[PDB]
Amino acid sequence: VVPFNGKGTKASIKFQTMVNWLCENRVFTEDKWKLVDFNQYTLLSSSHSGSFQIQSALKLAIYKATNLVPTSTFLLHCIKDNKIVKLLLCQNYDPLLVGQHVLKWIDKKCGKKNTLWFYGPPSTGKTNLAMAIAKSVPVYGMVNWNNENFPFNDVAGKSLVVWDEGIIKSTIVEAAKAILGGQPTRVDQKMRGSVAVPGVPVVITSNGDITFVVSGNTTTTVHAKALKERMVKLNFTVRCSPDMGLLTEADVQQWLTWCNAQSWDHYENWAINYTFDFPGINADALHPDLQ
Amino acid sequence: VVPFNGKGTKASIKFQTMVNWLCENRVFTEDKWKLVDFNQYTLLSSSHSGSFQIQSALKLAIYKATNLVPTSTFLLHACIKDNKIVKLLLCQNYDPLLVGQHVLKWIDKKCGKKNTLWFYGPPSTGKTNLAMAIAKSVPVYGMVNWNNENFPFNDVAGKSLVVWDEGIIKSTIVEAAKAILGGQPTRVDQKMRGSVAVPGVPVVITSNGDITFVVSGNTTTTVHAKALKERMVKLNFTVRCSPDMGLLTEADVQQWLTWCNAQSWDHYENWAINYTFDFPGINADALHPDLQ
Amino acid sequence: VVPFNGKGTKASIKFQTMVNWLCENRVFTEDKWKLVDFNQYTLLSSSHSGSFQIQSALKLAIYKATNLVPTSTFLLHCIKDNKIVKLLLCQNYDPLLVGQHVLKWIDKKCGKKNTLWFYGPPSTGKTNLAMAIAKSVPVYGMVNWNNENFPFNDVAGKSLVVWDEGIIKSTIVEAAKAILGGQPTRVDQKMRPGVPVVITSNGDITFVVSGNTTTTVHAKALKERMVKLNFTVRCSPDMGLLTEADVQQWLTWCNAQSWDHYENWAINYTFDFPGINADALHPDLQ
Amino acid sequence: VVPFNGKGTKASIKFQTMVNWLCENRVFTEDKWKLVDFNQYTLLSSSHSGSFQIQSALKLAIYKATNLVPTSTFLLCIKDNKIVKLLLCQNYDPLLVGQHVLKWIDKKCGKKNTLWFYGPPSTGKTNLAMAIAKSVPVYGMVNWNNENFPFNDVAGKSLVVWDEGIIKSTIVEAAKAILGGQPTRVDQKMRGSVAVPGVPVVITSNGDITFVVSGNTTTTVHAKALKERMVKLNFTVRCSPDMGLLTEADVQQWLTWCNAQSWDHYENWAINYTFDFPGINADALHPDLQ
Ligand SMILES: Nc1ncnc2c1ncn2[C@@H]1O[C@H](COP(=O)(O)OP(=O)(O)NP(=O)(O)O)[C@@H](O)[C@H]1O
Ligand SMILES: Nc1ncnc2c1ncn2[C@@H]1O[C@H](COP(=O)(O)OP(=O)(O)NP(=O)(O)O)[C@@H](O)[C@H]1O
Ligand SMILES: Nc1ncnc2c1ncn2[C@@H]1O[C@H](COP(=O)(O)OP(=O)(O)NP(=O)(O)O)[C@@H](O)[C@H]1O
Ligand SMILES: Nc1ncnc2c1ncn2[C@@H]1O[C@H](COP(=O)(O)OP(=O)(O)NP(=O)(O)O)[C@@H](O)[C@H]1O
Ligand SMILES: [Mg+2]
Ligand SMILES: [Mg+2]
Ligand SMILES: [Mg+2]
């Protein structure tokens, strides 16, 4: 599979440099391009043949950031002052295992446990944490934005699907089962080449148990066992301070930078047998920096 | 036929070379091209002219791979005891020599009316694994489960293989089923392509139960049972398999078919004179010492 | 009329030569072009100006081969050795007369009798002979490929229309009276010649289904437009496909024979085709 | 099974007598009742109860005539009969055919429930079929029903007549069951059993009905299936310009004579019902017709 020779001219080389510059500065939308580099956009729009190049370059940049680059590389660049590390300790979970699992999860390497689920009372910061992760990936999507009868459209081309205040109904149980489990949709099967893999990670925030499928005017539990195998459940029980504020990329990347530097032995021991719930803080193995 | 005495420019020769290169590297989709070679794709998509060239090259490469070059040449290659497929066939009591030799004719549409292979048996006996192994070797194939429920046979043309997994035939589409399973092209095929006859696509079917019985409402009917038997060939996978045989690979398929091509064809010509709905099993003495 | 004074460039003359090449080699479809000369097709498909010429040349070649050139010349290139000659002798039909009629029938010189009809028991070789002619003419079209309720789409541009094992429904009988009679469709008249039609069937086609009952209202009108041939004797399985050459040698030989015999019967075109006259059998056919 | 111990009043006995009278004179339609006896109809129509009694009597008479009595009862020197002359011209045994007609109308032929007449036009195909249809109490015609629903209101008839018929691929499935004598699903859901009504069918056509019309072409998939359920007759000989409309009297005389003769020659053919009806055997032809 040696690459074709194809010696290109300067016009194509400049376009390729622009495509690389798009990925390097995370410019994936027309609005972001206008907000960042207005002069180049104005110059490119002086002609139809120059306007076609914008639409040509954006698609290639998005595809490169989605499939040709590991997503975790966009995340990885004191520790005891990081808000997420402080926040996760307030919920009585080990920050190191959570951070280590997320990096393994975002690269679709957890196996069939593709979907994370955040559950707890309101005003515990579940939604705030989910937004920070979604803000850091190249492109993210929502189930809230999609149409009510077709909430699982526009899945392809996204690195993370966020479902806020979610709930599952019986009319969409067959679609949710495939997407939450990482199984590719038939669109990818009939567009790409047979059972592929891309799929997409999913993060869910909820104020109630989502394993209860809503059918008619009755709550049912036919699929409770089937759903649980696909998620890792976190209980956000402790209310957070009202003035914590929103989380940003610098907070998440700093937190994720520390986690990657530690040994994988602690995570890989539990990773052998995946459990529906996530283990809590173990004082016999807490990292010395967090003691 | 004397070819038209035209001569192309530098760009035309480059485009023809690119079409050949696409054929040689088994690239037939946009995603495959982006995965294999991103640089050439970017260079081609840098301008409006190249965006049309990409589509033309892909459309020509698919046609060249499917209609101009025999499919079996993509299977053969350019420790026979240890081949996984040979062991799997022996576990299910079938001769690896006859199975491989029949494929080299069925995949080439040379078997006449019997255009389909049928896999039957209990679950977890290895029906799906072998079926997908053949598919991964041919250039492009289509599986029925992708299509719409009411329209099962879309995009059948232009494919080297049709895959139907654990499917069941309904009476509402039994009329179209006898067409593809029989190897005769659909009505639209002749019209768009002028000739009353254009060969069909080979089909492979896996099933846990007898599909010769057609679903008709909430009732099973056997009126079409006779018609399916001369269009099909049956194999029985009656032995379960331990979880010690992972997914099969194209390397196993190529090695298996390579050996079957080199051996003599007398053992196949005897059966090929009058095809039988049942595929004969292992013969104790006919097994060659290379597999004894 | 004096042609225009326009002088073309190198590219235009090359395109005109390409059209002549396509017309000469009977390359009227994209699939045939790919199967015959893949190199030229790949060269042309490199850009827009090359791809447009493919469609333009195909359309011009079809028009030239259908309207500006007599179709019979496309068919003309041991007479007893030909398979078709024996086949017509078995059915008690004179090979010379039927051969001459086909040339006039394909050339629209038989007046209103624009339709041929093969009648007989099943498996008597009717479709084998009929399909042989369809592969000899430049372009042919079958009724069976068309939509069930629109059987007569894309009739213009075909050198021959074939209707195999067909039956006439009273809901569409009025359209059949036109095409089988050779009258041009009203759409052809608005935008701007008939197309020969051949019908093979097992029963009597003059009966028209009307509901769940047969009726004979249209039996009289359909008789004038058609010629009936009887294929009664079953064919041996070893005959196989009839080659386009077998038609070519048969038609070419019948062309050179004396034509005055056919003109005598041509004075009053009967619905029934006359059988073999033993006093008129050609010596070479014996 | 013992009849109920109840007793009917004087008025109910009159209605019971009226029901028997309707069956006795083959009065199954309102027009027939008006034509035959106007005084009684006018007297009955004087009020609500009399009008309702008309409907009740008609329904009960139809049921009694079609379900509780064998049809052959309504059908019950011979050289002068015109029907005998007709079959002799068509080269068929007058005695053998009549016995089959008696068994067929009584649903005693098993699967082969349908007759078929074939031949060139103007040879007596339709005339004979209508004469038999007139003799039985009630008959139905396929041509009267709607095109998309050719088999509506099949039950309740002693015979169903199909003239110049042709089978469309859309309705080929419904044709298989009814022509084969299989009961309709509608009656099974209503009556409760799995096989009850039973309807003989007679078909006359000028073309081969084994072929099924599908789209704009002919198919032979269903050819063998229909052959099992049908019997074929060839009317290949011409017929005089007059051959006056055959009457019920002509039919009744012919079948009565056939039933009187010995039945032994029939059941030999009934061992295995052949698709094609055997022709005249000049050796076995009855001496009266020799
Ligand atoms: N403007 C803000 N943006 C983000 N987080 C904020 C903001 N103001 C306060 N917060 C913090 O976020 C907490 C609640 O934010 P939110 O993300 O809605 O939490 P939650 O528990 O997921 N909410 P709920 O949707 O009610 O279940 C507050 O208690 C603060 O600690
Ligand atoms: N990717 C894989 N993961 C796990 N097991 C595999 C994989 N590929 C092959 N196998 C095993 O290889 C064997 C092939 O079985 P398979 O062909 O799937 O059987 P089957 O009867 O057609 N299956 P089913 O789809 O349940 O009807 C089984 O033992 C599988 O467990
Ligand atoms: N595909 C074929 N290959 C070889 N021989 C063929 C083929 N099709 C037909 N024949 C031969 O051609 C002769 C008659 O062919 P066929 O087209 O079936 O005739 P026909 O009278 O038009 N049939 P039918 O369609 O039943 O009316 C016989 O000798 C056949 O053996
Ligand atoms: N009104 C009539 N009643 C009785 N017989 C008639 C009548 N008119 C003509 N006939 C003659 O009766 C014979 C049969 O009549 P008919 O029932 O029309 O024949 P058929 O063979 O069933 N006709 P077709 O339906 O065209 O196949 C023929 O000799 C007719 O000439
Ligand atoms: Mg929330
Ligand atoms: Mg045919
Ligand atoms: Mg009649």
Side-chain angles (χ1 to χ4, degrees), chain B residues 113-142:
Chain B
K113 195 151 300 164
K114 274 173 164 55
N115 196 54
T116 59
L117 285 197
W118 178 22
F119 290 166
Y120 175 61
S124 302
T125 66
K127 322 178 307 284
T128 300
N129 211 336
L130 176 59
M132 291 285 288
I134 295 182
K136 297 297 181 184
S137 302
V138 302
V140 178
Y141 66 87

mmCIF file of all heavy atoms in Angstrom, chain B residues 113-142:
data_model
loop_
_atom_site.group_PDB
_atom_site.id
_atom_site.type_symbol
_atom_site.label_atom_id
_atom_site.label_comp_id
_atom_site.label_asym_id
_atom_site.label_seq_id
_atom_site.Cartn_x
_atom_site.Cartn_y
_atom_site.Cartn_z
ATOM 1 N N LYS B 113 -27.182 -23.277 -12.789
ATOM 2 C CA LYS B 113 -28.361 -22.844 -12.050
ATOM 3 C C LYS B 113 -28.121 -22.769 -10.546
ATOM 4 O O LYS B 113 -28.667 -21.875 -9.892
ATOM 5 C CB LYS B 113 -29.535 -23.779 -12.345
ATOM 6 C CG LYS B 113 -30.886 -23.228 -11.921
ATOM 7 C CD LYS B 113 -32.002 -23.777 -12.794
ATOM 8 C CE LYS B 113 -31.793 -23.410 -14.254
ATOM 9 N NZ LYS B 113 -32.635 -24.237 -15.161
ATOM 10 N N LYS B 114 -27.324 -23.679 -9.984
ATOM 11 C CA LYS B 114 -27.050 -23.682 -8.546
ATOM 12 C C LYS B 114 -26.057 -22.567 -8.220
ATOM 13 O O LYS B 114 -24.836 -22.733 -8.248
ATOM 14 C CB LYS B 114 -26.538 -25.043 -8.098
ATOM 15 C CG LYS B 114 -27.641 -26.028 -7.753
ATOM 16 C CD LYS B 114 -27.081 -27.408 -7.469
ATOM 17 C CE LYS B 114 -28.106 -28.282 -6.766
ATOM 18 N NZ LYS B 114 -29.377 -28.371 -7.536
ATOM 19 N N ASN B 115 -26.617 -21.401 -7.902
ATOM 20 C CA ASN B 115 -25.827 -20.195 -7.689
ATOM 21 C C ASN B 115 -25.625 -19.852 -6.218
ATOM 22 O O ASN B 115 -24.932 -18.874 -5.919
ATOM 23 C CB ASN B 115 -26.494 -19.014 -8.404
ATOM 24 C CG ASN B 115 -25.570 -17.824 -8.559
ATOM 25 O OD1 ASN B 115 -24.466 -17.947 -9.089
ATOM 26 N ND2 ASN B 115 -26.013 -16.665 -8.088
ATOM 27 N N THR B 116 -26.194 -20.620 -5.293
ATOM 28 C CA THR B 116 -26.216 -20.247 -3.885
ATOM 29 C C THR B 116 -25.618 -21.346 -3.019
ATOM 30 O O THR B 116 -25.715 -22.531 -3.353
ATOM 31 C CB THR B 116 -27.645 -19.954 -3.424
ATOM 32 O OG1 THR B 116 -28.462 -21.111 -3.634
ATOM 33 C CG2 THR B 116 -28.222 -18.794 -4.211
ATOM 34 N N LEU B 117 -24.999 -20.944 -1.913
ATOM 35 C CA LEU B 117 -24.548 -21.859 -0.874
ATOM 36 C C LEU B 117 -25.361 -21.605 0.387
ATOM 37 O O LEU B 117 -25.660 -20.453 0.716
ATOM 38 C CB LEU B 117 -23.057 -21.682 -0.586
ATOM 39 C CG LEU B 117 -22.077 -22.251 -1.613
ATOM 40 C CD1 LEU B 117 -20.691 -22.376 -1.003
ATOM 41 C CD2 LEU B 117 -22.559 -23.591 -2.138
ATOM 42 N N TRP B 118 -25.717 -22.678 1.088
ATOM 43 C CA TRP B 118 -26.575 -22.599 2.264
ATOM 44 C C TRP B 118 -25.861 -23.247 3.440
ATOM 45 O O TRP B 118 -25.439 -24.405 3.352
ATOM 46 C CB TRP B 118 -27.918 -23.282 1.999
ATOM 47 C CG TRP B 118 -28.849 -23.300 3.173
ATOM 48 C CD1 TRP B 118 -28.838 -22.459 4.246
ATOM 49 C CD2 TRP B 118 -29.940 -24.205 3.385
ATOM 50 N NE1 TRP B 118 -29.849 -22.786 5.116
ATOM 51 C CE2 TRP B 118 -30.541 -23.854 4.610
ATOM 52 C CE3 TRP B 118 -30.465 -25.278 2.660
ATOM 53 C CZ2 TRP B 118 -31.638 -24.538 5.125
ATOM 54 C CZ3 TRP B 118 -31.554 -25.955 3.172
ATOM 55 C CH2 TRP B 118 -32.129 -25.583 4.394
ATOM 56 N N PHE B 119 -25.728 -22.502 4.533
ATOM 57 C CA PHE B 119 -25.146 -23.011 5.769
ATOM 58 C C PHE B 119 -26.271 -23.260 6.766
ATOM 59 O O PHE B 119 -27.084 -22.367 7.024
ATOM 60 C CB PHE B 119 -24.126 -22.029 6.340
ATOM 61 C CG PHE B 119 -22.864 -21.923 5.532
ATOM 62 C CD1 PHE B 119 -21.978 -20.881 5.743
ATOM 63 C CD2 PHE B 119 -22.565 -22.865 4.563
ATOM 64 C CE1 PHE B 119 -20.818 -20.780 5.001
ATOM 65 C CE2 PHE B 119 -21.405 -22.769 3.819
ATOM 66 C CZ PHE B 119 -20.531 -21.725 4.038
ATOM 67 N N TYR B 120 -26.314 -24.468 7.322
ATOM 68 C CA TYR B 120 -27.379 -24.882 8.221
ATOM 69 C C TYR B 120 -26.787 -25.598 9.427
ATOM 70 O O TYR B 120 -25.816 -26.349 9.298
ATOM 71 C CB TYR B 120 -28.375 -25.795 7.497
ATOM 72 C CG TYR B 120 -29.452 -26.375 8.383
ATOM 73 C CD1 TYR B 120 -30.341 -25.552 9.057
ATOM 74 C CD2 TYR B 120 -29.585 -27.748 8.537
ATOM 75 C CE1 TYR B 120 -31.329 -26.078 9.864
ATOM 76 C CE2 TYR B 120 -30.570 -28.283 9.342
ATOM 77 C CZ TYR B 120 -31.440 -27.444 10.003
ATOM 78 O OH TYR B 120 -32.422 -27.973 10.806
ATOM 79 N N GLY B 121 -27.372 -25.361 10.598
ATOM 80 C CA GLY B 121 -26.930 -26.017 11.805
ATOM 81 C C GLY B 121 -27.255 -25.242 13.065
ATOM 82 O O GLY B 121 -27.757 -24.114 13.023
ATOM 83 N N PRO B 122 -26.975 -25.845 14.217
ATOM 84 C CA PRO B 122 -27.225 -25.177 15.500
ATOM 85 C C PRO B 122 -26.339 -23.956 15.665
ATOM 86 O O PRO B 122 -25.352 -23.791 14.932
ATOM 87 C CB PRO B 122 -26.878 -26.261 16.532
ATOM 88 C CG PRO B 122 -27.043 -27.547 15.794
ATOM 89 C CD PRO B 122 -26.593 -27.256 14.396
ATOM 90 N N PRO B 123 -26.665 -23.066 16.601
ATOM 91 C CA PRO B 123 -25.817 -21.890 16.823
ATOM 92 C C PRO B 123 -24.455 -22.272 17.387
ATOM 93 O O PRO B 123 -24.285 -23.325 18.006
ATOM 94 C CB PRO B 123 -26.622 -21.054 17.826
ATOM 95 C CG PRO B 123 -27.540 -22.027 18.484
ATOM 96 C CD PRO B 123 -27.884 -23.029 17.427
ATOM 97 N N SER B 124 -23.477 -21.397 17.145
ATOM 98 C CA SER B 124 -22.108 -21.529 17.643
ATOM 99 C C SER B 124 -21.389 -22.748 17.075
ATOM 100 O O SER B 124 -20.549 -23.347 17.753
ATOM 101 C CB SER B 124 -22.069 -21.564 19.176
ATOM 102 O OG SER B 124 -22.663 -20.403 19.727
ATOM 103 N N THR B 125 -21.698 -23.132 15.839
ATOM 104 C CA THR B 125 -20.983 -24.205 15.161
ATOM 105 C C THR B 125 -20.012 -23.700 14.101
ATOM 106 O O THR B 125 -19.356 -24.515 13.446
ATOM 107 C CB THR B 125 -21.971 -25.187 14.523
ATOM 108 O OG1 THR B 125 -22.685 -24.535 13.465
ATOM 109 C CG2 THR B 125 -22.950 -25.709 15.563
ATOM 110 N N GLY B 126 -19.903 -22.387 13.917
ATOM 111 C CA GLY B 126 -18.964 -21.828 12.968
ATOM 112 C C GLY B 126 -19.533 -21.465 11.616
ATOM 113 O O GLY B 126 -18.765 -21.338 10.656
ATOM 114 N N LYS B 127 -20.853 -21.302 11.502
ATOM 115 C CA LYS B 127 -21.450 -20.936 10.222
ATOM 116 C C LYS B 127 -21.085 -19.509 9.829
ATOM 117 O O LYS B 127 -20.680 -19.248 8.690
ATOM 118 C CB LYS B 127 -22.968 -21.105 10.289
ATOM 119 C CG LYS B 127 -23.426 -22.310 11.092
ATOM 120 C CD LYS B 127 -24.942 -22.393 11.149
ATOM 121 C CE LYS B 127 -25.548 -21.090 11.645
ATOM 122 N NZ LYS B 127 -25.397 -20.933 13.117
ATOM 123 N N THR B 128 -21.230 -18.569 10.766
ATOM 124 C CA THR B 128 -20.962 -17.165 10.467
ATOM 125 C C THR B 128 -19.489 -16.915 10.169
ATOM 126 O O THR B 128 -19.167 -16.139 9.262
ATOM 127 C CB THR B 128 -21.420 -16.285 11.632
ATOM 128 O OG1 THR B 128 -22.828 -16.453 11.836
ATOM 129 C CG2 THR B 128 -21.130 -14.818 11.348
ATOM 130 N N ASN B 129 -18.586 -17.560 10.913
ATOM 131 C CA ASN B 129 -17.160 -17.281 10.768
ATOM 132 C C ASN B 129 -16.669 -17.604 9.362
ATOM 133 O O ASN B 129 -15.983 -16.790 8.731
ATOM 134 C CB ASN B 129 -16.368 -18.072 11.808
ATOM 135 C CG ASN B 129 -15.101 -17.361 12.239
ATOM 136 O OD1 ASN B 129 -14.561 -16.534 11.506
ATOM 137 N ND2 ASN B 129 -14.619 -17.687 13.432
ATOM 138 N N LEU B 130 -17.007 -18.790 8.854
ATOM 139 C CA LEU B 130 -16.564 -19.169 7.515
ATOM 140 C C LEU B 130 -17.197 -18.281 6.452
ATOM 141 O O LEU B 130 -16.538 -17.902 5.476
ATOM 142 C CB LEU B 130 -16.886 -20.639 7.249
ATOM 143 C CG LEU B 130 -16.571 -21.146 5.840
ATOM 144 C CD1 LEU B 130 -15.097 -20.965 5.524
ATOM 145 C CD2 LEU B 130 -16.978 -22.602 5.687
ATOM 146 N N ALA B 131 -18.479 -17.945 6.620
ATOM 147 C CA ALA B 131 -19.173 -17.139 5.621
ATOM 148 C C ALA B 131 -18.532 -15.765 5.471
ATOM 149 O O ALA B 131 -18.359 -15.273 4.350
ATOM 150 C CB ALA B 131 -20.650 -17.004 5.990
ATOM 151 N N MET B 132 -18.173 -15.130 6.587
ATOM 152 C CA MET B 132 -17.546 -13.815 6.506
ATOM 153 C C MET B 132 -16.107 -13.906 6.020
ATOM 154 O O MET B 132 -15.559 -12.915 5.525
ATOM 155 C CB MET B 132 -17.608 -13.118 7.864
ATOM 156 C CG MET B 132 -19.009 -12.714 8.288
ATOM 157 S SD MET B 132 -19.616 -11.274 7.391
ATOM 158 C CE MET B 132 -18.627 -9.974 8.128
ATOM 159 N N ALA B 133 -15.479 -15.077 6.152
ATOM 160 C CA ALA B 133 -14.107 -15.236 5.681
ATOM 161 C C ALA B 133 -14.024 -15.118 4.165
ATOM 162 O O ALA B 133 -13.093 -14.501 3.635
ATOM 163 C CB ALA B 133 -13.545 -16.579 6.146
ATOM 164 N N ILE B 134 -14.985 -15.709 3.452
ATOM 165 C CA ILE B 134 -15.004 -15.606 1.994
ATOM 166 C C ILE B 134 -15.256 -14.164 1.571
ATOM 167 O O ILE B 134 -14.654 -13.663 0.614
ATOM 168 C CB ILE B 134 -16.059 -16.561 1.405
ATOM 169 C CG1 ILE B 134 -15.671 -18.016 1.675
ATOM 170 C CG2 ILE B 134 -16.222 -16.327 -0.087
ATOM 171 C CD1 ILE B 134 -16.637 -19.021 1.089
ATOM 172 N N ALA B 135 -16.146 -13.474 2.288
ATOM 173 C CA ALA B 135 -16.509 -12.110 1.918
ATOM 174 C C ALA B 135 -15.319 -11.163 2.019
ATOM 175 O O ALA B 135 -15.153 -10.275 1.176
ATOM 176 C CB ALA B 135 -17.659 -11.620 2.798
ATOM 177 N N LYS B 136 -14.476 -11.336 3.039
ATOM 178 C CA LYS B 136 -13.351 -10.426 3.230
ATOM 179 C C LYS B 136 -12.295 -10.560 2.140
ATOM 180 O O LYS B 136 -11.417 -9.697 2.041
ATOM 181 C CB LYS B 136 -12.713 -10.652 4.601
ATOM 182 C CG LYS B 136 -13.645 -10.364 5.763
ATOM 183 C CD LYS B 136 -14.059 -8.903 5.777
ATOM 184 C CE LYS B 136 -14.972 -8.599 6.951
ATOM 185 N NZ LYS B 136 -15.462 -7.193 6.920
ATOM 186 N N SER B 137 -12.358 -11.610 1.323
ATOM 187 C CA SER B 137 -11.377 -11.809 0.266
ATOM 188 C C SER B 137 -11.795 -11.196 -1.065
ATOM 189 O O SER B 137 -10.930 -10.710 -1.802
ATOM 190 C CB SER B 137 -11.105 -13.303 0.075
ATOM 191 O OG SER B 137 -10.643 -13.893 1.278
ATOM 192 N N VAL B 138 -13.085 -11.204 -1.389
ATOM 193 C CA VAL B 138 -13.571 -10.613 -2.636
ATOM 194 C C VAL B 138 -13.472 -9.095 -2.520
ATOM 195 O O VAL B 138 -13.463 -8.564 -1.401
ATOM 196 C CB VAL B 138 -15.006 -11.067 -2.949
ATOM 197 C CG1 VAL B 138 -15.072 -12.582 -3.045
ATOM 198 C CG2 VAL B 138 -15.975 -10.548 -1.901
ATOM 199 N N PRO B 139 -13.372 -8.360 -3.638
ATOM 200 C CA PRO B 139 -13.196 -6.902 -3.552
ATOM 201 C C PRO B 139 -14.322 -6.184 -2.823
ATOM 202 O O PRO B 139 -14.084 -5.511 -1.815
ATOM 203 C CB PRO B 139 -13.135 -6.477 -5.023
ATOM 204 C CG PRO B 139 -12.621 -7.677 -5.730
ATOM 205 C CD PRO B 139 -13.253 -8.840 -5.025
ATOM 206 N N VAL B 140 -15.549 -6.320 -3.320
ATOM 207 C CA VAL B 140 -16.702 -5.625 -2.760
ATOM 208 C C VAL B 140 -17.866 -6.602 -2.673
ATOM 209 O O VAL B 140 -18.141 -7.344 -3.622
ATOM 210 C CB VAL B 140 -17.097 -4.391 -3.601
ATOM 211 C CG1 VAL B 140 -18.327 -3.715 -3.013
ATOM 212 C CG2 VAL B 140 -15.943 -3.406 -3.694
ATOM 213 N N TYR B 141 -18.552 -6.596 -1.533
ATOM 214 C CA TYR B 141 -19.729 -7.425 -1.324
ATOM 215 C C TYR B 141 -20.779 -6.633 -0.560
ATOM 216 O O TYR B 141 -20.472 -5.652 0.123
ATOM 217 C CB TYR B 141 -19.379 -8.713 -0.569
ATOM 218 C CG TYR B 141 -18.909 -8.498 0.854
ATOM 219 C CD1 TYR B 141 -19.814 -8.421 1.906
ATOM 220 C CD2 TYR B 141 -17.561 -8.349 1.140
ATOM 221 C CE1 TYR B 141 -19.384 -8.223 3.202
ATOM 222 C CE2 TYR B 141 -17.122 -8.148 2.434
ATOM 223 C CZ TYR B 141 -18.038 -8.087 3.461
ATOM 224 O OH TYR B 141 -17.609 -7.885 4.752
ATOM 225 N N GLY B 142 -22.021 -7.073 -0.677
ATOM 226 C CA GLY B 142 -23.136 -6.452 0.024
ATOM 227 C C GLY B 142 -23.900 -7.472 0.843
ATOM 228 O O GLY B 142 -24.166 -8.579 0.374
#
